Amino acid sequence: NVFQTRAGCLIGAEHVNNSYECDIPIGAGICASYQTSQSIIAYTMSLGAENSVAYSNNSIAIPTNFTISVTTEIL
Amino acid sequence: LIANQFNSAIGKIQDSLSSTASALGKLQDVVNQNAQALNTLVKQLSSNFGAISSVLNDILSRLDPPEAEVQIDRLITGRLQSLQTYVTQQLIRAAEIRASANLAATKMSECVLGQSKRVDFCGKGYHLMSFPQSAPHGVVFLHVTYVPAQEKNFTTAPAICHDGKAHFPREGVFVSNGTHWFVTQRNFYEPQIITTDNTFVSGNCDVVIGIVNNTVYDPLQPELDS
Amino acid sequence: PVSMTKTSVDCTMYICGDSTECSNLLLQYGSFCTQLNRALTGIAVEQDKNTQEVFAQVKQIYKTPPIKDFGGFNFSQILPDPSKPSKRSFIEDLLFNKVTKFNGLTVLPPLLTDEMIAQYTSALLAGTITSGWTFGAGAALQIPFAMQMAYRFNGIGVTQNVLYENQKLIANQFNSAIGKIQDSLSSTASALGKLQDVVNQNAQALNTLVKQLSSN
Amino acid sequence: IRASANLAATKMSECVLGQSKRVDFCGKGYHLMSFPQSAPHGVVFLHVT
Amino acid sequence: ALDPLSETKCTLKSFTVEKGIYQTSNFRVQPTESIVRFPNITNLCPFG
Ligand SMILES: *[C@@H]1O[C@H](CO)[C@@H](O)[C@H](O)[C@H]1NC(C)=O
Ligand SMILES: *[C@@H]1O[C@H](CO)[C@@H](O)[C@H](O)[C@H]1NC(C)=O
Ligand SMILES: *[C@@H]1O[C@H](CO)[C@@H](O)[C@H](O)[C@H]1NC(C)=O
Ligand SMILES: *[C@@H]1O[C@H](CO)[C@@H](O)[C@H](O)[C@H]1NC(C)=O
């Protein structure tokens, strides 16, 4: 249970090939979390959901419905 | 529908702020930092800095002035250095607080007292308004924004050929559901008949790349024919 | 500039490395070196936070479609190069190529590596070229690039027909301007000086630090 | 550097993700669009006006 | 000094440690033996 990364030596966390959102940042793209029976896992943090656009020169995506949202900004 | 959505969203915000404590962290830590700093200063009263005792009442009640002065000199050097570090940290933190307060003041000015055209400056989405709320050493802005929810894919064209002239939409965009061509506002699907009060003429169909051939209704024709 | 070098200086090793008596004498000062360690860790986490706030502003990863028809606008100079091991653009490669210990001072690697920052930039570029501003305020809604340029022109008060009549000319001028930007960025490196000096300053600081290890 | 990063983040949010109406905020001229590019410890904005 | 958890506990002077990463100490490899090297001096000096 020893993992060598560009951030150093990590002992106790299991290396998982699957990528997830960063929970506890370690560094150099490596982040840690507690997941499944449960244990500490280390993984390359994901950058977001993959979403390609249906681009063309004669197509428009127009909203037919909307929503009114409220966000909280603390300062 | 807008009223119901706004009320439900305000209820959700209430539930989140009453159920998530960490949502206040960005404020609490600040206080903690200050407290931490203060604590460190207090802890610096326990250091000897080489003196035989940390409490001054013991030093003055044990040493003759010629040596009590040396011990007090060590103590005052240490204490003045620690206090100087403390006040420097406090000044830097106060500069940061002043920057954040200026940002919050600009936000209050351009978001609550008016309408901000800056995207993502008053929250995610098309900003509509904002409401201020007090907080212990803080401000909470409730930003009301417009977000597209459901979308549809239509066929478009940069211009429409009617009689050899190039017609462009005054407001909105030309779309096609597969059988009919309409003009609708960009931020909401609302197909309208292509008319002369919705489009304008400029040039001919020989300049626009991708212009489609269709018809443009003239409201003056049925009025003049009768 | 966005971030600095995440330097971390070990107090105990810097002042009294491999010396027990010096550490015992330093213990007579309380929590000075611990508080400076806390300060440098705060600096590091602040650098990571500003990097995250600058680059991680999109919820999805956007990509350009296999079709490159942008109405004559050539974007291969700022789009990613699929042939490079680091998925960065040609201009970004030129920029990266044109920019230039054991006493308890270390350098922690950044949380967000160069490849992830390049992927962020590519996603944002694809979003802004293929969906306008809809991907920021909401979902990425496809719009032809000519129509996006027409919207940008309507935003400044010039009619879309003025763009359409000079569409080929506008595209040619844009391509020539991108080529000129490439030439200017490849010719001289002083344009990015506002960054390099920063590093130099930090380096100089470190230098001064180690130089103060030689004073009596 | 934190102040400069806040400025760069605001500029990327309002000039790349939208159309800013401030003159000289997105380069000389009437702002049309902006493109972000990575750089060693920095960001290069191509402001098209 | 029992385990990394207790190390974090006394570095944070608290019985409750929140979720996150915390720097606790500094590891340093200790030398195993001493190596003395001196010239093969062949002549005791007439100090007497
Ligand atoms: C774009 O317009 C050209 C010109 O007619 C057409 O051939 C092409 O199919 C259109 N779509 C794409 C994706 O190029
Ligand atoms: C739009 O979506 C909301 C979601 O709650 C729904 O209540 C409303 O009926 C929808 N309106 C239309 C016109 O689709
Ligand atoms: C109508 O538009 C089409 C589209 O290219 C063009 O070929 C045709 O000449 C135009 N005029 C007609 C059909 O009278
Ligand atoms: C853009 O320019 C490159 C060379 O500068 C060329 O290879 C390419 O065909 C051009 N058009 C694109 C990428 O659509």
Q: Would you say B182 and B174 are in contact if contact means Cβ atoms under 8 Å apart?
A: yes
Terminal C-alpha separation, chain B: 43
Question: Which long-range contacts (C-beta less than 8 Å, at least 24 apart) are formed by B99-102?
Answer: B99/D3, B100/A75
Residue carrying the six token digits 């030596």: A9
Token pair recorded at residue D23: 């003159």
Residue carrying the six token digits 């002369």: B196
Output Rg (C-alpha) for chain C, integer angstroms: 24
How many residues are listed for chain E in this entry?
Answer: 48
Mutate to test the pocket of ligand 2, among A64, A65, A68, A69 (most ligand atoms within 8 A of CB): A65
Amino acid at B107: K
* Phi, psi (deg, nearest 5) at residue B23: -65, -10
Cα–Cα distances in angstroms (integers) from residue B10 to residues A70, B2, B5, in the given order: 7, 12, 9
What's the rounded Cα separation, in Å, for the pair B182 and C110? 52
Nearest to B43 by CA among A19, D41, C29: C29
What's the rounded Cα separation, in Å, for the pair C186 and C94? 7
Q: From the CB of residue B68, how many other CB atoms can be counted at a distance below 10 Å?
A: 16
What's the rounded Cα separation, in Å, for the pair A28 and C115? 10
Cα–Cα distances in angstroms (integers) from residue C62 to residues B101, B131, C134, D43, in the given order: 35, 33, 13, 19
Token pair recorded at residue C82: 């699929």
Instruction: Give the chain D residue whose CA is nearest to the CA of C44.
Output: D2
What's the rounded Cα separation, in Å, for the pair C138 and E29? 54
Nearest to C75 by CA among D40, D9, D28, D37: D37
Question: Which long-range contacts (C-beta less than 8 Å, at least 24 apart) are formed by B121-124?
Answer: B121/D10, B121/D13, B121/D14, B123/A69, B123/A71, B123/A73, B124/A69, B124/A71, B124/C136, B124/C137
Token pair recorded at residue A63: 């909203």
Residue A29: which H helix or E strand, with range? none
Residue B169 CB burial class (10 angstroms; 0-12, 13-18, ≥19): buried
Q: Would you say B151 and A56 are in contact if contact means Cβ atoms under 8 Å apart?
A: no
* Phi, psi (deg, nearest 5) at residue D36: -90, 150
Q: How far is the CA of B163 from the centre of ligand 3 (A)?
A: 10
Residue A48 CB burial class (10 angstroms; 0-12, 13-18, ≥19): middle
What's the rounded Cα separation, in Å, for the pair C113 and A47? 11
Q: Would you say C160 and B156 are in contact if contact means Cβ atoms under 8 Å apart?
A: no
Can you tell me whether residue B101 is helix, strand or coil?
A: helix
What's the rounded Cα separation, in Å, for the pair C9 and C131? 46
Mutate to test the pocket of ligand 3, among B213, B214, B215 (most ligand atoms within 8 A of CB): B213
Taking phi over 0 as left and psi of -120 to 50 as alpha, with beta for the rest, B31 belongs to alpha
Residue carrying the six token digits 């370690």: A26
Instruction: Give the chain D residue whose CA is nearest to the CA of B103.
Output: D6
- Kindly state if the Cβ of B213 falls inside 6 Å of ligand 3: yes
Residue carrying the six token digits 């169909």: B205
Contact flag B120-D3 (C-beta cutoff 8 Å) = no
Cα–Cα distances in angstroms (integers) from residue A72 to residues B13, C14, C39, in the given order: 8, 44, 29
Q: How far is the CA of D16 from the centre of ligand 2 (A)?
A: 30
Q: At what angle do helices C90-97 and C114-130 cross, to 10 degrees?
A: 150
Q: From the CB of residue B139, how many other CB atoms can be counted at a distance below 10 Å?
A: 18
Contacts of C120 (CB under 8 A, 6+ apart): A47, C55, C56, C58, D38
Q: Would you say B199 and B168 are in contact if contact means Cβ atoms under 8 Å apart?
A: yes
What one-character DSSP code corresponds to residue B186?
Answer: T
- Kindly state if the Cβ of C51 falls inside 6 Å of ligand 4: no
Q: What is the DSSP code string of C27-78?
A: GGG-SHHHHHHHHHHHHHHHHHHHHHHHH---SEEEE--S---SSS---TTT
Cα–Cα distances in angstroms (integers) from residue B206 to residues B160, B161, B166, C144, in the given order: 11, 9, 8, 20
Residue nearest to atom 8 of ligand 1 (CA): A57
**Strands B199-204 and B165-169: what pairing?**
antiparallel
Contacts of C13 (CB under 8 A, 6+ apart): C103, C104, E26, E28
Can you tell me whether residue A47 is helix, strand or coil?
A: coil
Token pair recorded at residue E39: 């010239």
Nearest to B119 among C30, C137, C144 (CB): C137
Q: Is A26 on the interface with E (CB under 8 A)?
A: yes
Can you tell me whether residue C106 is helix, strand or coil?
A: strand
Q: What is the DSSP code string of C141-190?
A: ----HHHHHHHHHHTTT--HHHHHHTHHHHHHHHHHHHHHHHHHHHH-SG
Instruction: Give the chain E residue whose CA is nearest to the CA of C40.
Output: E23
Chain center to CA of B30: 20
Q: Would you say C120 and C60 are in contact if contact means Cβ atoms under 8 Å apart?
A: no
What's the rounded Cα separation, in Å, for the pair C94 and A63? 40
What's the rounded Cα separation, in Å, for the pair C30 and B44? 6
Residue nearest to atom 6 of ligand 3 (CA): B213
Mutate to test the pocket of ligand 1, among A57, A59, A60 (most ligand atoms within 8 A of CB): A57
* Phi, psi (deg, nearest 5) at residue B118: -75, 125
- Put simply, the chain E residues between 1 and 48 with a CB less than 8 A from any chain A CB are 19-21
What one-character DSSP code corresponds to residue C108?
Answer: P
**C13 contact residues in E (CB cutoff 8 A):** 26, 28
Chain C: nearest CA to B165, how far in angstroms? 12
* Phi, psi (deg, nearest 5) at residue C25: -70, -30
Chain B: nearest CA to C110, how far in angstroms? 22
Residue carrying the six token digits 């560009």: A6
Token pair recorded at residue C192: 């990015």
Q: Would you say C150 and C132 are in contact if contact means Cβ atoms under 8 Å apart?
A: no
- Kindly state if the Cβ of C202 falls inside 6 Å of ligand 4: no
**D47 contact residues in C (CB cutoff 8 A):** none
What one-character DSSP code corresponds to residue B192?
Answer: B
A14, β-bridge pairs: A41
Q: How far is the CA of B183 from the centre of ligand 2 (A)?
A: 22
What's the rounded Cα separation, in Å, for the pair B175 and B191? 8
Query: What is the torsion angle, in degrees rounded to the nearest 10, for the CA atoms of residue B107, residue B108, residue B114 and residue B116?
Result: 10
Q: From the CB of residue C15, how many other CB atoms can be counted at a distance below 10 Å?
A: 16
What's the rounded Cα separation, in Å, for the pair E37 and A5? 38
Q: What is the DSSP code string of B117-140?
A: -STTTSSSSEEEEEEEEEETTEEE
Chain D: nearest CA to C137, how far in angstroms? 8
Output Rg (C-alpha) for chain A, integer angstroms: 19
**Strands A8-11 and A14-15: what pairing?**
unpaired
The ligand placed nearest to the CA atom of residue C68 is 4
Contact flag B44-C31 (C-beta cutoff 8 Å) = yes
Q: From the CB of residue C137, how many other CB atoms can be counted at a distance below 10 Å?
A: 21
Residue B28 CB burial class (10 angstroms; 0-12, 13-18, ≥19): middle
